[PDB]
Design a protein around this ligand. Structure first.
Ligand SMILES: *[C@@H]1O[C@H](CO)[C@@H](O[C@@H]2O[C@H](CO)[C@@H](O)[C@H](O)[C@H]2NC(C)=O)[C@H](O)[C@H]1NC(C)=O
Ligand SMILES: *[C@@H]1O[C@H](CO)[C@@H](O[C@@H]2O[C@H](CO)[C@@H](O)[C@H](O)[C@H]2NC(C)=O)[C@H](O)[C@H]1NC(C)=O
Ligand SMILES: O=c1ccn([C@@H]2O[C@H](COP(=O)(O)OP(=O)(O)O)[C@@H](O)[C@H]2O)c(=O)[nH]1
Ligand SMILES: O=c1ccn([C@@H]2O[C@H](COP(=O)(O)OP(=O)(O)O)[C@@H](O)[C@H]2O)c(=O)[nH]1
Ligand SMILES: *[C@@H]1O[C@H](CO)[C@@H](O)[C@H](O)[C@H]1NC(C)=O
Ligand SMILES: *[C@@H]1O[C@H](CO)[C@@H](O)[C@H](O)[C@H]1NC(C)=O
Ligand SMILES: O=C(O)CCC(=O)C(=O)O
Ligand SMILES: O=C(O)CCC(=O)C(=O)O
Ligand SMILES: [Fe+2]
Ligand SMILES: [Fe+2]
Ligand SMILES: [Fe+2]
Ligand SMILES: [Fe+2]
Ligand SMILES: [Mn+2]
Ligand SMILES: [Mn+2]
Lengths: 700, 700
């Protein structure tokens, strides 16, 4: 049993990148001892991501090995560090190395690289990997010194070609007992074997298994174009996220804060923007520490921005607006806002927030800053769907692809902080990173590629991790796809596309409490119920939308009201049909009125059918009253729309068989009463002003 | 101006018949002085109604005139008495006689009778009547003596031929100044001139006018086959009935009573016969003075007669039943009952009452006896129509015809006692008249003619008046035309044909009072009303009709009840459709439930539509209860049909939204409640016995 104290891991790293630090964390988890070569130096090995190179690694290793040229008692493992993680213990590693019977065991891979022509010189292997990969090897210190000392080449010559040529010397291969880990017992190279690797979970750690050979590799190498697949594995292996411990590097459970540049982007017509702008004032972060940049590309939103701007200017440390007149593209505007933070050494963090992002968590900015990442996004999801502001995987064309764990993350079955290839709509970036690592201005622009993909590719090309937190509930994404802007108040028509935000804006704030009981719903007249339904904003916008239509009812108009033996009781009204709001109002009936009716009339079941939906206008100048009648409905919904006293002086509704009067209606509240037989009712005259009400004859 | 004291009216009458007495009354009304010849004697003039004769009249007149052979100061008018009425005063008569310039003026007529061949010998008259009629003439006593003294012929030779021959002597006609009243200035003979005669009314007397000649005759003569037309005129002329005095000979405003034979005839299946038999016990006339004869031709009515017979035998002085086993024809039975009174000298009055006659006036028998007529019928009319138990006129074939005043009599615009050609269904006949004037047994029988017409013709042939009183309200006639006898209780199906009697038998006696208000209708639960609807007899017969059908509901039966989201609430029931009682029950809803609903729910209008009408049976053995549900109706009618405690031990109806229970239902009473939304209701379990209810889901 070889002593683990005799094992030394050697790797090369010119900077403490996130990949190098990810490697070190995996090494410390198994109590390895690591020696890092080259931390101070500038990299002369070439563009190794692009082409051959890395000879500088062999030069540094050769110098380091002269210490141990005679140490037959020492086992040394050399691995890359930027794209490698450790998945097993030194004891298991040394056990498998002895089992191999080799004195220097190289990792194996599917491709003969760089010189494909040398594939014939390799020994035949039946089912395993045939060719050498220099990203990982392990052997006696003496044997390794005999190989690396033969290096006398350029810093940008290929390291793998150097090792391949020595391995293909049959006499040297037999002399020094050189071997390749054909079946990935120790080394797993991902390039060319992605379908062979799966995650194997345990209680408090995660490994990988090669299902082609049924092995549990020690070293995971994301060589070549498998960096993102390694990022995926590195979220779990070895202690990134575990079934019983949760994530291993997140904050989990949570004197002046850093100064922040907050950039807001309005690049399309987006619903509920006045609500978004008001929400900026509620973010829980000292506003004197926040600088606001807002780009609006939409002339539709200029009035919305103008209403909010006095409050925003009075709130934040400094504000700046770039409107549609500047004719900035989305990529140009995002480059401008980011470079404003980059060129200001007082900007410690950059917070980009798009208009379709709804932050329900007011501590979002704090939470993300505590995570101490270069780049991190909060997970935001379109309500009740899978689409969200990140991608778990990339297609070979670098377009969208679904990762194996994407649904678990979106549904928050696994929570933590995740290294992902794509983020959008909301993220926090270290200002230091913009200055020192992404100094160029063309982050979002410079090519035909879409700005938000260019942004993510710019960071991936520099080896910067894009982090995503679902550790908390942060918010949601608004649907903006088919936002019909040709209305006086377009957000009235948003009941289908954004029902959660629609409810918060237009449904009475005390509706939900009344639906659950606890003494809000009133019964002012025998079987007449009274409950809050619409918010004042809903009432004002519905009335305004009616007057904007303008074509109120007149003579020869017929409503479905029963008086005596004739249905000849009319009102000056506008039906939802004529303004194209019928489908919308019927959705409100199904969702909010239906369930309220079934609760107040136990035993009755409703699907909220209604062909008669209309707003009535009472005025002394035209039609101030409504004579006694029955409604052609099973029950009737009657919603006030303005204020008694402020907007009109006049009575409400009188139920004659009870001599009961609703004399003071409440603006947001709705009356619910039977329509036939028993509640013969009358609309008392409006004596001054204008009285608006909304009425539906439901279940006729 | 000729003195009225010098005028003597002479007539012939062998008996004081009603026609002779009618003549005398008209004569006394104008203060005429009348001398009647022949009152003691037997008539030897022959069958004057059949053929020629009446020479006995001339013989008596000749003897009488020998007193006045020299009295040139005396004017004498000879007229028949049985078929003559006086319409004008002696002053007007004497004025018109002088105006004629005649010394003996005969009445004129259209027909040359008896010898038609003598028509050539008559003088030509342009437009008036050409021929002599001996039924009336007026002239100086001396001139009349010169003519009548030439009589030397048989008692059964023709009187008119005798006068005609003397008038056709041209020398004698010129000598004695004989003339004919060509234009009916004094005498109106009806035969051949019916279209010329109309009634002329005044305040307190009635005359006739001849519209062909524009005259106001003094003497109205119903000669030949115009006796019935004279009967018609005699109801008015001269003081029979007047616009301001009413009728002139009726009782108008009303110690042992006479003994009466009451005969009841059941000659067809007739509705509500048990009610008729019970009504016999309520007639206001001392029952110890009444003998009962009842002929039933219907085996259908044998059980009805049997139930009533102990009460009738205990009530009246004597009773006798002749049932269907005797196989008597209607004419044979009516002859038998009438001859029973005829052969009993203790029978002072005979009262024939048919089963379709409903006597609402319990004093009918008294009232008619006070009228002191030989024969009199009470006017009885089929409800709301013109058909009644008398004819005002006869066709030439002696079948039905409408008289000019028939509608005024039936509608009681003119009330009184009327001489009519036909009566039926109810009449009172003097026993003396049966013994002395109609002694034969074949009154109703003896010929192919219908029995009730034979009866009337038998009296008309004897000159007996058939009187009819509409001076009071007496009752009505039941419709019996299409009485469907194939039911367990056929009178349940009588709602259309006899609605007044149907209501009194089956509608709750206190229903009408409740419909008018005054604290009968109750509201035991909020909008649930409770009112008496059906009588106990209706409930018992409806239940019995249901069990007689027997085919109650079972598994897979579906009623239109709403529970949760499904219409799967069934009951063990029988619908009115399956027993053929739907149309009948719908008529009850329209007539009685509809108006009750519109009164209790002001503003609601109903036509009482209902497709779901059914009787429910609750039993512990099968289905004792009914789970909570809504009815598929605007409102629901729920009628108990038997007794809580006596027939079943179990709860009634529970309305859950009110925690209100109808624990003790009332047999005849009905519940009225809304069917949808608000009155979720439950049928509490029946724990013992059987519970029957009737329910209609109206206005679905
Ligand atoms: C929703 O309910 C809350 C509490 O029941 C209401 O808050 C009250 O508002 C009135 C005036 O609007 C104040 O006088 C009370 O002091 C408030 N009570 C509390 C506990 O804050 C609120 O008004 C309701 N919302 C609407 C739109 O009516
Ligand atoms: C119809 O109403 C009358 C009077 O309102 C009811 O007569 C009463 O009947 C009860 C027993 O049924 C007696 O105790 C009372 O003394 C009666 N009152 C009078 C004034 O006679 C009659 O019962 C009602 N009819 C039905 C079928 O219930
Ligand atoms: O700027 C650099 C680039 C490379 N490396 C080291 O050289 C190794 C080879 O780089 P890479 O993993 O990207 O090449 P690949 O394994 O994909 O062939 C890295 O893991 C680092 O340890 C370094 O230290 N600094
Ligand atoms: O039994 C009779 C029949 C006849 N008359 C008298 O004779 C008249 C002639 O009879 P009738 O009127 O019936 O004959 P008509 O006028 O129709 O020719 C009657 O009016 C009676 O006054 C009579 O006294 N007793
Ligand atoms: C690593 O070493 C420490 C002592 O420095 C020891 O407490 C710990 O248990 C070791 N962990 C593993 C996984 O070997
Ligand atoms: C008839 O005579 C009486 C007197 O006997 C007289 O009072 C009455 O007025 C007379 N009536 C007529 C109509 O002449
Ligand atoms: O004016 C009111 O409050 C009553 C209106 C009404 O009943 C109707 O629209 O049918
Ligand atoms: O049993 C009862 O009284 C209720 C019956 C009922 O509600 C029904 O027939 O629908
Ligand atoms: Fe309307
Ligand atoms: Fe209404
Ligand atoms: Fe049924
Ligand atoms: Fe029911
Ligand atoms: Mn590598
Ligand atoms: Mn006559």
């Amino acid at each position: 049993p070889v002593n683990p104290e005799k094992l030394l891991v050697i790797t090369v790293a010119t900077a403490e990148t996130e990949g190098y630090l990810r490697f070190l964390r995996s090494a410390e988890f198994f109590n390895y001892t690591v020696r890092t070569l080259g931390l101070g130096e500038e990299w002369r090995g070439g563009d190794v991501a692009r082409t051959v190179g890395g000879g500088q690694k062999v030069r540094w290793l050769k110098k380091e090995m002269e210490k141990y040229a005679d140490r037959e008692d020492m086992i040394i493992m050399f691995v890359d560090s930027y794209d490698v993680i450790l998945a097993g213990s030194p004891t298991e590693l040394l056990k498998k190395f002895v089992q191999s019977g080799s004195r220097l065991l190289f990792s194996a891979e599917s491709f003969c690289w760089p010189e494909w022509g040398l594939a014939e010189q390799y020994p035949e292997v039946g089912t395993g990997k045939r060719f050498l990969n220099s990203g990982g090897f392990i052997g006696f210190a003496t044997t390794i010194h005999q190989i690396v000392r033969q290096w006398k080449y350029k810093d940008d010559d290929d390291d793998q070609l150097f090792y391949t040529r020595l391995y293909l010397d049959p006499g040297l291969r037999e002399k020094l007992s050189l071997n390749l880990d054909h079946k990935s017992r120790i080394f797993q190279n991902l390039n060319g074997a992605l379908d062979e690797v799966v995650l194997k979970f345990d209680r408090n750690r995660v490994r990988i298994r090669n299902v082609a050979y049924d092995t549990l590799p020690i070293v995971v190498h994301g060589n070549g174009p498998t960096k993102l697949q390694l990022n995926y594995l590195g979220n779990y292996v070895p202690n990134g996220w575990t079934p019983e411990g949760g994530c291993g590097f997140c904050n989990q459970d949570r004197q002046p804060p850093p100064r922040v540049f907050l950039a807001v982007f309005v690049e399309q017509p987006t619903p509920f923007l006045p609500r978004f702008l008001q929400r900026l004032l509620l973010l829980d972060y000292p506003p004197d520490r926040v600088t606001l940049f807002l780009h609006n590309n939409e002339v539709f939103h200029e009035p919305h921005i103008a209403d909010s701007w006095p409050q925003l200017q009075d709130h934040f440390s400094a504000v700046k607006l770039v409107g549609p007149e500047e004719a900035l593209s989305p990529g140009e505007a995002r480059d401008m806002a980011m470079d404003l933070c980059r060129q200001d050494p007082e900007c410690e963090f950059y917070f980009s927030l798009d208009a379709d992002a709804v932050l329900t968590n007011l501590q979002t900015l704090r939470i993300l800053i505590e995570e101490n990442r270069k780049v991190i996004a909060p997970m935001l999801s379109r309500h009740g769907k899978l689409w969200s502001n990140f991608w778990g995987a990339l297609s070979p064309d670098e377009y969208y692809a679904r990762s194996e764990d994407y649904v678990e993350l979106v549904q928050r079955k696994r929570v933590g902080v995740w290294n992902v290839p794509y983020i959008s709509q909301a993220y926090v970036i270290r200002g230091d990173t913009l200055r020192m690592e992404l100094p160029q201005r063309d982050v979002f622009s410079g090519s035909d590629t879409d700005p938000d993909m260019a942004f993510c590719k710019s960071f991936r090309d520099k080896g910067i991790f894009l982090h995503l937190s679902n550790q908390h509930e942060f918010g949601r994404l608004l649907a903006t796809s088919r936002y019909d802007t040709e209305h006086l108040h377009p957000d009235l028509w948003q009941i289908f596309d954004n029902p959660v935000d629609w409810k918060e804006q237009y449904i009475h704030e005390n509706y939900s409490r009344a639906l659950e009981g606890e003494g809000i719903v009133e019964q002012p007249c025998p079987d007449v119920y009274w409950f809050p339904l619409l918010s004042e904003q809903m009432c004002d916008e519905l009335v305004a939308e009616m007057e904007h239509y303008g074509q109120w009812s007149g003579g020869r108009h017929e409503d479905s009201r029963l008086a005596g033996g004739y249905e000849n009781v009319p009102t000056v009204d506008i039906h939802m049909k004529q303004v194209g709001y019928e489908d919308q109002w019927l959705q409100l009936l199904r969702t909010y009125v239906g369930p309220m009716t079934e609760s107040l009339f136990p035993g009755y079941h409703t699907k909220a059918r209604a062909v008669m939906n209309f707003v009535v206008r009472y005025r002394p100048d035209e039609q101030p009253s409504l004579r006694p009648h029955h409604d052609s409905s099973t029950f009737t919904l009657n919603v006030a729309l303005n204020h008694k006293g402020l907007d009109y002086e006049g009575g409400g509704c009188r139920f004659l068989r009870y001599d009961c009067v609703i004399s003071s209606p409440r603006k947001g509240w709705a009356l619910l009463h039977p329509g036939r037989l028993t509640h013969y009712h009358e609309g008392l005259p409006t004596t001054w002003g204008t009285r608006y009400i909304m009425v539906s004859f439901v279940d006729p």
